[model samples]
Target: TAPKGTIYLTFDDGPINASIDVINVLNEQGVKGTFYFNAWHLDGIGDENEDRALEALKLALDTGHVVANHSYAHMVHNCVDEFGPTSGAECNATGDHQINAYQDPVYDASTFADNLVVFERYLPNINSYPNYFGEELARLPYTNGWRITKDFKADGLCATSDDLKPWEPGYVCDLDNPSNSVKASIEVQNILANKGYQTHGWDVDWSPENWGIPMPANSLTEAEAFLGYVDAALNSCAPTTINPINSKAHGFPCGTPLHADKVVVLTHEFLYEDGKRGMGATQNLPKLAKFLRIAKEAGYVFDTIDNYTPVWQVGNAYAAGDYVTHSGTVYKAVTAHIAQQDWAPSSTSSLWTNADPATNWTLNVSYEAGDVVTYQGLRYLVNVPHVSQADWTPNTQNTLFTAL
Candidate 1:
């Protein structure tokens, strides 16, 4: 938390009429802001205007800003009864229940498949696209932590943070009310941490009125408000408090000056002016332009949540490690770290599983429950099912309930 003079002016929600202007301002100032985008939040409804969204993404990439994920749908199932309560309620600007995926718990894999298709078909392919270099950034749906299982797909997926928001009524899905808020946040963070995924939260909001969906084309048009927001963000905390905010819908928690542990500005392209949200998103571009300018003048530096810290930079005593029960046993970090069941002797443990072996404490330090050891001084964090010092049970609590 030392005095720092680096500015990272990030904007959420775009592909709007003002998005181009936001990009233009950053381009003019020679500064970069990370843009968190959802494929469905494009200019038009559903999957339309992908080209327009790509144009906005291309602009960000071309302007030296970064483009990252904000989930294919950005669903909020609990607040919105996953049983189709808000089925067609234009809760989001996109006007669709983003989470309605074939009856909740893995009915058909097609929903997820379609979600990825949305990413593939509509999202600007950072790798293959001609518009600037493709992005390797992503924000997850409802900020759900990566759960690699038979039903789930892929690994090393990205989601900046879980659904829990700073304001009251933080998002909670699938889990019972566990009382404490910070604990819930850490639990979800640990879920992602176990998967080798990095999540990010915001330090400040740069919206005019803390509008949930920053439709910069709305009532307020003072550019200084945006500048004021950015100014506070840069000077608020030395480096620890004020960072960036992921301003998700219906609220940004940014209307005045405030310090944040980390800042992540949030918004969606479709709702930026309410165009496709059945009520277009407005009042965003002017604020965005002004915010970019203020960020430069104040001097902030930006980095993606991914690569925020090094991959192998596993820390000491990091809380919330992932746990998976394997063959009635448990393992952490990766399932492969589990030791073989058979062991004839201490050093020759692998030779003893089936052999009539006695006093077999066979598996060495290669695996254990909740143990952090210095193997060649490179820390290896292991958490398994048992109750050890470093043992971390998965949120699922060691249940490999696979659905075929």
Candidate 2:
């Protein structure tokens, strides 16, 4: 069912007034999308805007859309104040209030965990939604970083800079250490994995002409041009081309179209607003409707981000060579079979083959000379043919094995 091209429409920073219309368009098209939301705008602290924000959140959930976290207050940027015309000096002043999670000296694993809890403070009942079990599926605010799994990790090359955008000049990251901001982001990703969270980033962004203003109804071509972007993305590496930050991960499947047939598109829910520079509900809604119709007509399947990649399920059926991830480790089905409770990929070797050898070390296995196997996160070459034992560990049996 998944051989055809798949597109995941992911909207960020939402539960706003325009989100209602966005969901309505998706429903009218009989398609679903993923919304990465922040509840700060819906915290009952604003006026009628806040109330509609809450209603939009409920509507998104009730309409079978995937609800995900985009951080509580956008983590750093004060986006609400950014829509108006402003001088460079004023934008620089506003940037001073923002925190660079990776570059900030104070950011650490503990603080990153604190930021992860922002959703709970506002949307305590978030896990009650179908397909979400408080697993912490999220998108980092203001950055195109990802921590999908241990092997598929990646960072957006130019998504965010040390200097704030539309304001200060560009920033130069240190080549050796880079910036604390990037390192801190990597640490936060590791911590999220440890906490059982799955993070994702976007491949293409549907942006407006201006950074602050919403996309006009006529701003983007809803048919050929948009599909052109999707077509190119499915064949090219993108959103990871910036050097240094993402340079080390050249062969990673994070940006490769061949490995990940599905593409995640980033857009904002506020783009459909009817007033104050918006193209109005009726006008903009048709753009999305037309896009959906064209995509469906072209045989592209619309899916949510959670289902963007296959997650190994206990009872699901799998065909030979189907890929799935279980407990952060990727595996390929050795043959067509129905998965069972005790036959998880981690424990069953015959039915599954580990894709990444950096982890998933197996013990008590027989090995021939020159055979390589991972043990305790390190690869070891067998020096002699013999069955492994608890006492004959790779670390202790230096003469019997060599670390590769």
Residue 26's C-alpha lDDT in candidate 1? 59
**Model 2 vs. true fold: TM:** 0.71
TM-score of each: 0.48, 0.71
What are the runs in model 2 whose C-alpha is more than 4 Å off? 1-4, 44-48, 77-125, 164-177, 209-218, 241-259, 280-282, 313-321, 325-342, 346-404
Please give, for residues 357-404, the per-residue lDDT of candidate 2 as tens digits. Answer: 222234434356887766677888889976555688788899888998
lDDT of 1 by residue, 198-278 (tens): 334444443334333444335443556654554555434322333222222211233222223234454444434545433
The candidate that wins on lDDT is 2
lDDT of 2: 0.61
Model 1 lDDT on a 0 to 1 scale? 0.37
- Name the lDDT value of residue 150 in candidate 2: 31
**Local error of candidate 1 at residue 145 (angstroms):** 9.7
